[PDB]
């Protein structure tokens, strides 16, 4: 596939200097960040509770900011 859904590291996130392939925007809710990944797709980062991932959980609830 023209993917990898390699979730690369959070200090990788920081810059996020990835390649392009299915990039576009996607469905990221408030608080959250969108970075390109190496593989060819953007991620979803979360800066409250420092963790990443593919899926939106902005599709069954929008910005839940983490406040501790």
Same mark, same amino acid.
């Given at each position: 596939? *023209? @993917? @990898? /859904?390699? $979730?690369?590291?959070?200090?990788?996130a920081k810059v996020?200097?990835?390649?392009?392939?299915?990039?576009? *925007?996607?469905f $990221?809710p408030?608080? #959250? /960040?969108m970075? !390109?990944?190496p @593989?060819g797709?953007?991620?979803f !980062?979360d800066?409250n509770?420092?963790?990443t991932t #593919? /899926?939106?959980?902005?599709?069954?609830?929008?910005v839940?900011?983490?406040?501790?």
């Open positions: 596939m *023209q @993917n @990898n /859904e390699e $979730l690369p590291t959070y200090e990788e996020g200097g990835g390649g392009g392939s299915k990039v576009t *925007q996607s $990221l408030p608080g #959250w /960040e970075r !390109i990944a @593989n797709r953007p991620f !980062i800066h509770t420092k963790t #593919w /899926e939106d959980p902005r599709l069954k609830f929008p839940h900011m983490r406040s501790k």
